[PDB]
Predict the structure.
Amino acid sequence: IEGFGVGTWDLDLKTWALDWSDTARTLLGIGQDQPASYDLFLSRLEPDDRERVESAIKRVSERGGGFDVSFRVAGTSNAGQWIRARAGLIRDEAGTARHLSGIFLDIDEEKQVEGALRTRETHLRSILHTIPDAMIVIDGHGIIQLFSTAAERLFGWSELEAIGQNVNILMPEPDRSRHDSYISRYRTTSDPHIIGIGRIVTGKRRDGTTFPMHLSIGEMQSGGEPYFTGFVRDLTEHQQTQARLQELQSELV
Amino acid sequence: IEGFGVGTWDLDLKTWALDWSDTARTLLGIGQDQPASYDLFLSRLEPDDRERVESAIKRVSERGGGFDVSFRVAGTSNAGQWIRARAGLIRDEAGTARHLSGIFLDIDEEKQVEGALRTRETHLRSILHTIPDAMIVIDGHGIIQLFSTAAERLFGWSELEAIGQNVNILMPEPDRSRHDSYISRYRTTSDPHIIGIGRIVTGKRRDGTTFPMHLSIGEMQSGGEPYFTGFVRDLTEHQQTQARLQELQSELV
Ligand code: HEM
Ligand code: HEM
Ligand SMILES: [C-]#N
Ligand SMILES: [C-]#N
């Protein structure tokens, strides 16, 4: 084999011989000189990972549903080469299991993407828990997707209650009945409305109590659908104080 | 082979004959009785990917460092299946490679993860550009990781100027020289929900001017290190209307 970025390997169930290709030994961090061995292989694997490999080899000898295990050999320094081993059985004319044959795949890119996603989700939960303004995310038909802690305290809905509801549950009439059409008309666009301007509206808690609020939308695209992130600033204290200011001034005459 | 979960295929450059695994037939969504053929393979690809596959076989036909391209096949309607095709060259006895041979991998999970990360990154840029409050993310040593649009407007640094700088560039003395010690003193504390307490500090613009500000922090853990997300609110206008309210409340008392 030449230029195959995949390694290959074969483990006879009868003679316990293991042979692998040249790219296979480089992936394991094994030299030229070192001969192929079932025990050299289990030595490149940190302890618990060995148990998973051998338990999987015995299970593939039994029921025989394939072999798929992934592991990190300490191949370089201490960050390692992630590898996914895949294999299936070879039988003889009698149909006894004889050879376990398959591949080693480099999966360092796949594990890097997997952990970049994990960090993103952990950061999203952190923003959702922590942002002082209510943050609401909706899809292109107004259905709430994400709902921050500040939004739960402001609107009286838990995020499990809110998610999957229309965002219109947060609104008094008439905006409540019209909000789907405000979104639909923007989705026709030609930019008559700008999403970024910001506006003061009235929202209402699950109470039925209403309150002034300012909010800001940002738009994003994903998977052929728009999504909108809203940040809500309660203005009850802001308008109690400016009211007291105007009153005091006009009274001092 | 048996429960390999991977298809194998061997195409000859010279005879254009193709043999695929039985497991590879299910991946292409067709072939219950119809024999393998190179024309039938390109028939399952969309006529944008089949152009890419032909360029890839030509590329490896003349000095190719392997063969590695991925594509979505329709499989069956509403059942598109992403797969990754990998292959290498193999020689006869002395001359140019007889047959180009390799594997078909099911990569539906890999591309769900890739798309989920892509959605997360798009959302973070949207949040960063839309959020009204200055959002700043630092690592365990106070190095700025992220810097939102409102942060650049408020502090006077671009994100490209800010990222990789210590967060203490945003503060005056004495806090500027002590902020690193605040972070390390906190990291050897282990009590949760002390970062959750807000505080009123003074910030410093790159301008050199100072302003009162409130901010709130959330911790997260990733990769062995903490990260902190600050939400900064300018209090300049809040403290001056609150001062002109209660000094116009003392015109009579
Ligand atoms: C809960 C209180 C809310 C109220 C009372 C409200 C009200 C409104 C109004 C009055 C308009 C259009 C005004 C006009 O064209 O005459 C509008 C548009 C829109 N709103 Fe809301 N809204 C609320 C929350 C939200 C949230 C939280 C989001 C997104 C996360 C959102 C997304 C949109 C979109 C996409 C549009 C169409 C484009 C635009 O004009 O900005 N709304 N909304
Ligand atoms: C912009 C100007 C800032 C100033 C003037 C400032 C000031 C301070 C002060 C005075 C303390 C310690 C209070 C005490 O010891 O009693 C502190 C602690 C801390 N700061 Fe900042 N800070 C600023 C921005 C930030 C930002 C944006 C973040 C994070 C993204 C941050 C992260 C921390 C952390 C993690 C601590 C320790 C946790 C705590 O006890 O509060 N700082 N900062
Ligand atoms: C919605 N504004
Ligand atoms: C920083 N507080």
